[PDB]
Amino acid sequence: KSWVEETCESIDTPECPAEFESPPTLLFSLDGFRAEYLHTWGGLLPVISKLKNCGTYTKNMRPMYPTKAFPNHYSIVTGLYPESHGIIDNKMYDPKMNASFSLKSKEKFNPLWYKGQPIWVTANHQEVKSGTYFWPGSDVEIDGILPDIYKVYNGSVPFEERILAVLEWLQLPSHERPHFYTLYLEEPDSSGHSHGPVSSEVIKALQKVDRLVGMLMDGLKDLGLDKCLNLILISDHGMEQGSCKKYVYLNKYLGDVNNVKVVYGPAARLRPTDVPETYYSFNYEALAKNLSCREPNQHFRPYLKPFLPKRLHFAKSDRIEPLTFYLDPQWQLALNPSERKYCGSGFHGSDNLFSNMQALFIGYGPAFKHGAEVDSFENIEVYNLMCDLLGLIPAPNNGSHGSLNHLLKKPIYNPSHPKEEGFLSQCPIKSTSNDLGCTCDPWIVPIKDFEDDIYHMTVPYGRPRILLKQHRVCLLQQQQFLTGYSLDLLMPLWASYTFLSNDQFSRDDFSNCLYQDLRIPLSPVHKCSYYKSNSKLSYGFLTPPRLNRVSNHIYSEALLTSNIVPMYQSFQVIWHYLHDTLLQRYAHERNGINVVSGPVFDFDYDGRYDSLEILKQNSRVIRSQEILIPTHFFIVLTSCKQLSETPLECSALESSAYILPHRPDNIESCTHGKRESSWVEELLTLHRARVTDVELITGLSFYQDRQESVSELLRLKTHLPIFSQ
Ligand SMILES: Nc1nc2c(ncn2[C@@H]2O[C@@H]3COP(=O)(O)O[C@H]4[C@@H](O)[C@H](n5cnc6c(N)ncnc65)O[C@@H]4COP(=O)(O)O[C@H]3[C@H]2O)c(=O)[nH]1
Numbered sequence: 001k002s003w004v005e006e007t008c009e010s011i012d013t014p015e016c017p018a019e020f021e022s023p024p025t026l027l028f029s030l031d032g033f034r035a036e037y038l039h040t041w042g043g044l045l046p047v048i049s050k051l052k053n054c055g056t057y058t059k060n061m062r063p064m065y066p067t068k069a070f071p072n073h074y075s076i077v078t079g080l081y082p083e084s085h086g087i088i089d090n091k092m093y094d095p096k097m098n099a100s101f102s103l104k105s106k107e108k109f110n111p112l113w114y115k116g117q118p119i120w121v122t123a124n125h126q127e128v129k130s131g132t133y134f135w136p137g138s139d140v141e142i143d144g145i146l147p148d149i150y151k152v153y154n155g156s157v158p159f160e161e162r163i164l165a166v167l168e169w170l171q172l173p174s175h176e177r178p179h180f181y182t183l184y185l186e187e188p189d190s191s192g193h194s195h196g197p198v199s200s201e202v203i204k205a206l207q208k209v210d211r212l213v214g215m216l217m218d219g220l221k222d223l224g225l226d227k228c229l230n231l232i233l234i235s236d237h238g239m240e241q242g243s244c245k246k247y248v249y250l251n252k253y254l255g256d257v258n259n260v261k262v263v264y265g266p267a268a269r270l271r272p273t274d275v276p277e278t279y280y281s282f283n284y285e286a287l288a289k290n291l292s293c294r295e296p297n298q299h300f301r302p303y304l305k306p307f308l309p310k311r312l313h314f315a316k317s318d319r320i321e322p323l324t325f326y327l328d329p330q331w332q333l334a335l336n337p338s339e340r341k342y343c344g345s346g347f348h349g350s351d352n353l354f355s356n357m358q359a360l361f362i363g364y365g366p367a368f369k370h371g372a373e374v375d376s377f378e379n380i381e382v383y384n385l386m387c388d389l390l391g392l393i394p395a396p397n398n399g400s401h402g403s404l405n406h407l408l409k410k411p412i413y414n415p416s417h418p419k420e421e422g423f424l425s426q427c428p429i430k431s432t433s434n435d436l437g438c439t440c441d442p443w444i445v446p447i448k449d450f451e452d453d454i455y456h457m458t459v460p461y462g463r464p465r466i467l468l469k470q471h472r473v474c475l476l477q478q479q480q481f482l483t484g485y486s487l488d489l490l491m492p493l494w495a496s497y498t499f500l501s502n503d504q505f506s507r508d509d510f511s512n513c514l515y516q517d518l519r520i521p522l523s524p525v526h527k528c529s530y531y532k533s534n535s536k537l538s539y540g541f542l543t544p545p546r547l548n549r550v551s552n553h554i555y556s557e558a559l560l561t562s563n564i565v566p567m568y569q570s571f572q573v574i575w576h577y578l579h580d581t582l583l584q585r586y587a588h589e590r591n592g593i594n595v596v597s598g599p600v601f602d603f604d605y606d607g608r609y610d611s612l613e614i615l616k617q618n619s620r621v622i623r624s625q626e627i628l629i630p631t632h633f634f635i636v637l638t639s640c641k642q643l644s645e646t647p648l649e650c651s652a653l654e655s656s657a658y659i660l661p662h663r664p665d666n667i668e669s670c671t672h673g674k675r676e677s678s679w680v681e682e683l684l685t686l687h688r689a690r691v692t693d694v695e696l697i698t699g700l701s702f703y704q705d706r707q708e709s710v711s712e713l714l715r716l717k718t719h720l721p722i723f724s725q
């Protein structure tokens with residue numbers, strides 16, 4: 001009898017032959033196996049269906065951007081974003097190397113491309129052997145290390161021979177046998193490209209790899225290993241149907257230029273042809289602006305790379321061109337029709353939250369649960385998991401160690417909340433009152449005399465913790481919100497408040513009206529007079545003064561100088577619509593929301609909060625005062641899973657996070673032709689982010705006082721919703 005015909009039985013303990021002290025881990029990639037293939041054609045794939053039903057499965061493993069083979073395979077084995085591990089696409093130009101990378105060039109074997117630490121190198125350093133039958137990077141000497149057994153990539157090797165070789169490796173004596181293995185097949189990616197994802201050729205390709213996995217499982221059973229091996233069946237990305245009618249050609253807007261090179265496809269990038277001499281002097285911004293808002297409902301958008309949504313984490317590599325393009329589902333871009341492959345084939349590379357880009361993940365073996373279906377997770381999380389399976393300490397990476405513990409029968413690593421590394425103080429009322437130059441309207445109720453339940457109301461999940469190392473913060477308590485105030489930057493790092501479903505906003509105006517918070521040092525850029533007619537810059541509020549839960553008028557404590565941030569007039573359009581219109585609707589839909597908002601400073605576009613050194617280099621002198629202008633603003637919205645519960649009494653949390661670019665115009669949204677502001681909601685959706693994304697870029701940590709385990713909270717904070725096509 002074959003493995004697939006046996007009944008599914010629980011493997012609570014590894015059932016291993018005498019020559020095996022612990023089960024190995026095998027990482028098995030089916031290139032271009034989009035998650036939906038199993039959703040729809042599972043009945044035709046008996047082998048992979050048994051792995052899913054007898055193992056641990058997610059409907060969608062989220063890939064990394066761009067959704068191509070080399071970035072994503074190397075992300076899986078490093079736990080790193082492509083921008084950090086250096087393999088940002090299958091084809092790259094490095095201006096400092098003055099060298100081009102591609103899959104059919106000898107540069108593919110040059111170790112200088114491959115950063116980070118792949119799991120076989122991690123294993124080597126910790127006395128664990130590896131055998132790789134193809135995997136990007138595995139035929140390259142990385143950190144002076146090669147897998148104990150490896151194969152130089154050769155796509156012509158029959159799939160059966162690859163599986164048989166691994167099965168022979170598993171028969172090696174213990175002192176030479178690897179503990180970690182890889183297998184890689186080019187299908188169903190090959191048929192998806194040549195014939196499209198919805199084709200009889202892809203179905204044949206899916207049946208072929210299903211029989212090949214069965215061949216693997218049958219071999220393990222013959223060796224007595226089918227209950228002594230942790231299998232991770234995975235893919236690098238999904239597949240989409242391209243069209244010649246959904247292809248953007250830049251020469252429509254630029255003319256038939258030849259001084260630029262465009263990496264064609266859905267995640268296209270642009271650089272001058274005269275490199276490296278002009279790689280940094282080229283006027284990318286002028287080119288980006290010439291390509292912006294040219295068509296109604298334009299299906300491509302130019303982005304200078306720091307302006308891409310942070311959730312993509314696609315900017316901190318010199319191999320990522322300063323100009324990139326973001327493409328709608330099914331759409332691709334090239335310089336002209338001669339600079340691209342066939343426009344009607346299957347393709348991938350698009351936004352890693354598009355449903356058809358989602359990837360496969362099944363875990364099967366002693367370590368994995370039986371019949372468990374788990375929420376989506378990113379493939380950068382798998383490196384830590386394989387480390388736990390192999391008894392390895394992981395190298396530093398972007399996965400959140402412990403966030404996949406719910407996949408395992410018995411979690412290996414027990415995660416902790418990060419320590420608060422800030423310096424916390426109390427801010428005393430010890431500021432001499434000064435004229436702010438404000439002209440408050442008569443209906444603004446002043447703060448004439450400045451001199452537990454409220455705390456829980458404003459931070460019902462616990463206050464955000466300051467991860468910023470040695471940063472000086474004091475907590476400012478108000479009746480309706482809590483502020484984490486930076487004494488080093490003289491502006492608030494976050495404000496937290498709860499917006500109940502029946503709470504009303506005030507209609508009154510409050511222009512050019514502030515009250516000096518006598519608990520903080522007075523700065524010239526705290527005053528109304530500084531921003532008066534300041535064409536360069538205005539100010540905005542973290543907590544909305546119109547929200548007043550007790551009284552009918554403007555909430556005067558929200559007018560404190562500790563509650564304002566520098567803010568462009570252009571961004572005020574977004575911020576005002578968010579708070580005057582969207583938040584009220586979200587609170588109706590969610591039965592209230594808790595809100596935390598604040599500034600972000602990521603001037604070096606690495607997705608992490610900036611050092612003091614970096615902030616000093618990016619300060620601006622405006623109206624004879626040094627001022628630090630945020631690069632983004634964050635907002636985190638939290639409510640209950642059960643709609644009968646208000647945010648102060650959640651049995652379980654629902655979280656939405658956003659990292660909004662703080663730009664001095666709204667060219668990103670193409671608003672010249674618009675007479676209503678719903679485009680603000682589209683901008684929010686595009687720039688949604690994991691809670692963990694916000695934590696990394698602000699040095700803050702949320703929800704630490706909740707009773708859920710740390711791993712459960714990591715699951716909440718790493719989640720990101722998929723755009724359903
Ligand atoms: N729109 C479109 N794009 C295509 C088509 N055919 C290929 N592409 C693209 O060219 C790349 C080369 O595919 P290949 O068939 O020549 O080699 C395959 C495979 O042989 C190769 N490869 C896989 N592992 C490798 C490895 N370890 N080393 C070197 N090359 C490797 O990667 C390629 C698939 O990864 P990919 O889809 O992200 O990139 C494709 C893909 O993005 C096509 O028909 N239509």
Ligand SMILES: *[C@@H]1O[C@H](CO)[C@@H](O[C@@H]2O[C@H](CO)[C@@H](O[C@H]3O[C@H](CO)[C@@H](O)[C@H](O)[C@@H]3O)[C@H](O)[C@H]2NC(C)=O)[C@H](O)[C@H]1NC(C)=O
Nearest residue numbers: 080081084085115116117313396397398399606607608696
């Ligand atoms: C994703 O995880 C990466 C690995 O932890 C992380 O990259 C690391 O970033 C730090 C901080 O920039 C670098 O640390 C050192 O950088 C230079 C040395 O080159 C020093 O001047 C610094 O003081 C510091 O010691 C690491 O070199 C870097 N590691 C790698 C492999 O890139 C990324 O930041 C993470 N990405 C996100 C968005 O969180």
Ligand SMILES: *[C@@H]1O[C@H](CO)[C@@H](O)[C@H](O)[C@H]1NC(C)=O
Nearest residue numbers: 097098099100274275276277
């Ligand atoms: C960059 O490398 C290419 C090799 O493809 C070479 O032709 C060119 O002269 C080099 N330019 C500089 C400035 O080094």
Ligand SMILES: *[C@@H]1O[C@H](CO)[C@@H](O)[C@H](O)[C@H]1NC(C)=O
Nearest residue numbers: 152153154155156157158161
């Ligand atoms: C690739 O493998 C095939 C066998 O499947 C072999 O004929 C061919 O010579 C190999 N290529 C190289 C460069 O070794």
Ligand SMILES: *[C@@H]1O[C@H](CO)[C@@H](O)[C@H](O)[C@H]1NC(C)=O
Nearest residue numbers: 283285286287288289290291
């Ligand atoms: C278009 O590009 C030119 C350079 O060729 C630049 O001077 C101009 O400012 C750009 N147009 C816009 C609207 O930015």
Ligand SMILES: [Ca+2]
Nearest residue numbers: 602608609610
């Ligand atoms: Ca930064």
Ligand SMILES: [Cl-]
Nearest residue numbers: 086317318319
């Ligand atoms: Cl790099």
Ligand SMILES: [Cl-]
Nearest residue numbers: 091092093263
């Ligand atoms: Cl390139």
Ligand SMILES: [Cl-]
Nearest residue numbers: 295298299300
């Ligand atoms: Cl278009």
Ligand SMILES: [Cl-]
Nearest residue numbers: 346347348349
């Ligand atoms: Cl492609």
Ligand SMILES: [Cl-]
Nearest residue numbers: 014023366367
């Ligand atoms: Cl195990």
Ligand SMILES: [Cl-]
Nearest residue numbers: 705706707708
């Ligand atoms: Cl709780």
Ligand SMILES: [Zn+2]
Nearest residue numbers: 031032069236
């Ligand atoms: Zn692929």
Ligand SMILES: [Zn+2]
Nearest residue numbers: 032189193348
């Ligand atoms: Zn492909």
